[PDB]
């Protein structure tokens, strides 16, 4: 029965039981957890328990601002740079899967509905030193699959209808709230299927669950010297509803595209040994020596 | 009281009598899609007893070195009976499931079956960066076998899979598990040929063991779709 819980439950005092009838012995096979109370197992005292439960609220457990993107690029003249390089601008398809602390926390659930509070920290380093330029950056939110700019002075940066944020390095970090955007009532943290009508689509990736694109340029023309500009994107989920909890990820993540697994070479978190080994089942690992 | 159980759906009936008090997934019973959650505006077909009935799959041989078995829903049923025909003739699908997993043996046999229904069991592959293909995931009525059931083939854990709707078949206690699944999707309905809402996983946590006469011990899966809706009628795909 659903109830409001702000503190952990009190313990009632209990006495000696010696009864022939009603049971510390439950039924595992029903899939139910043991409802055996400590009052029924040992002889207890009354404890008025004032321990709050608010820090394990799913809103508090997930509304931590976590690093989701970290991109360095050269801020310089890119007349003669490679066609792979971020030429004063990068684009980033927003995902929660590239950094494993946020990834494992969000993958504790099957479905998540949250607004995405996006914080953008920019740091700059000179590639001799003459000082750091207070550069203006543009972060433009582009939807999944939509047109992203192809150069720094692209006419896609005009943002007639795309939301752009302009921000300076000397400023506080740029901060935007992206709404809950999904075409569904929740994001699918795990998607058991293909999101395409042919059989060649990607498994596990529903583009409904992709927030969108951060297209981040430097608005400034290049300086006579080069700079390395590191953009860090932080996401805080908020107004979070979470559904269907899952086993946590035990093995190391291999990719962001899937739930592929290798494990570590030895215990802990190996394919065939998640917990580190002890010598025997009757060996106590941190036995007090007296 | 908990052992005796009678399951009548349509023309199908199951009497299990070594059961262990059936699991309703997340305390939720299957319902039809209400009007305040509905999206597709055409009148759905609700075939009732033509689809809301137990579908028995092929039995699997519980053997000594078995790792586990999985079936994905609705994919295990998308080609069976009038459920499969309503799946193949409609774009949209919504149902719950009544899963009844059956495995008996003697009073001299030992063995525990974790029978667990996993929502959105996005399978990972082992020792590669390539995602599993269509043929690895969409096995249909035959189902698949767990590669590494200890991490549930997704880098997580068998040990914490009791967070999902599950029962056990401990051969001491019971011979049947019964999980009642509601609709479990972020969307109201779904295209049943490219998405699986539930994966029934059946895993030997304790292996089959005896010292009596060795018989084939099978695990039989009977799945009843519950409260089937089908929208977007067209030709058969």
């Amino acid at each position: 029965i659903e109830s409001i819980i702000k503190t952990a439950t009190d313990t009632v005092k209990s006495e000696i039981n010696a009864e022939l009838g009603v049971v510390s012995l439950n039924a595992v096979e029903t899939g139910a957890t043991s409802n055996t109370e400590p009052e029924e197992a040992i002889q207890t005292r009354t404890v008025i328990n004032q321990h709050g439960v608010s820090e394990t609220l799913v809103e508090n457990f997930l509304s931590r601002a976590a690093l989701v993107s970290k991109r360095s690029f050269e801020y310089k003249d890119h007349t003669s740079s490679a066609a792979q390089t971020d030429k004063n601008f990068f684009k980033w398809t927003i995902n929660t899967r590239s950094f494993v602390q946020l990834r494992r926390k969000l993958e504790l659930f099957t479905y998540l509905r949250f607004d995405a509070e996006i914080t953008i920290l920019t740091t700059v380093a000179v590639n001799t030193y003459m000082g750091l330029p207070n550069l203006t950056l543009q972060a433009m939110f582009v939807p999944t699959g939509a047109l992203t700019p192809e150069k720094q002075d692209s006419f896609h940066w005009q943002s007639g209808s795309n939301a752009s944020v302009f921000f300076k390095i000397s400023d506080p970090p740029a901060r935007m709230t992206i709404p809950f955007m999904c075409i569904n009532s929740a994001y699918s943290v795990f998607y058991d299927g293909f999101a395409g009508f042919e059989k060649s689509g990607l498994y596990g990736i529903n583009p409904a669950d992709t927030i969108g694109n951060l297209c981040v340029r430097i608005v400034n023309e290049h300086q006579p010297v080069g700079f390395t500009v590191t953009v860090r994107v932080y996401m805080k989920p908020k107004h979070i509803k979470a559904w269907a909890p899952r086993p946590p990820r035990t093995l190391p993540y291999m990719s962001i595209a899937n739930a592929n697994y290798k494990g570590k070479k030895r215990a802990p978190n190996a394919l065939n040994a998640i917990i580190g080994n002890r010598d025997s089942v009757k060996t106590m690992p941190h036995n007090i020596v007296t | 009281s908990d052992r005796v159980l009678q399951l009548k759906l349509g023309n199908s009936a199951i009497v299990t009598q070594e059961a262990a008090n059936y699991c309703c997934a997340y305390g939720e019973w299957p319902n039809y899609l209400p009007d305040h959650e509905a999206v597709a505006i055409d009148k759905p077909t609700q075939p009732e007893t033509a689809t809301d009935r137990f579908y028995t799959l092929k039995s699997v041989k519980w053997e000594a070195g078995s790792t586990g078995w999985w079936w994905k829903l609705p994919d295990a049923l998308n080609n069976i009976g009038m459920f499969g025909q309503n799946v193949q003739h409609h774009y949209l699908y919504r149902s719950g499931f009544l899963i009844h997993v059956q495995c008996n043996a003697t009073r001299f046999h030992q063995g525990a079956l974790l029978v667990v229904a996993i929502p959105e069991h996005q399978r990972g592959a082992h020792n590669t960066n390539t995602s599993p293909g269509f043929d690895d995931i969409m096995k249909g009525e035959e189902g698949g076998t767990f590669n590494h059931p200890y991490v549930l083939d997704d880098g997580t854990s068998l040990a914490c899979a009791t967070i999902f709707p599950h029962q056990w078949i401990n051969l001491r206690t019971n011979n049947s598990a019964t999980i009642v699944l509601p609709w479990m999707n972020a969307a109201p309905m779904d295209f049943p040929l490219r998405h699986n809402q539930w994966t029934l996983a059946i895993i030997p946590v304790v292996p089959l063991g005896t010292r009596t006469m060795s018989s084939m011990v099978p695990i039989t899966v009977s799945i009843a779709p519950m409260c089937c809706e089908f929208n977007g009628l067209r030709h058969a795909i």
Binding site: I5, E59, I240 | Y22, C23
Partner: peptide, 30 residues
């Protein structure tokens, strides 16, 4: 405090103390 016109813009809602653990600990029927 929220001076934005969208309700999703607001701060986090750390006020929902409703629990129903029995849908995970007792998902049984009898």
């Amino acid at each position: 405090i929220n001076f934005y016109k969208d309700s999703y813009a607001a701060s986090a809602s750390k006020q929902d103390f409703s629990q129903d653990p029995s849908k995970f600990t007792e998902p049984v029927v009898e």
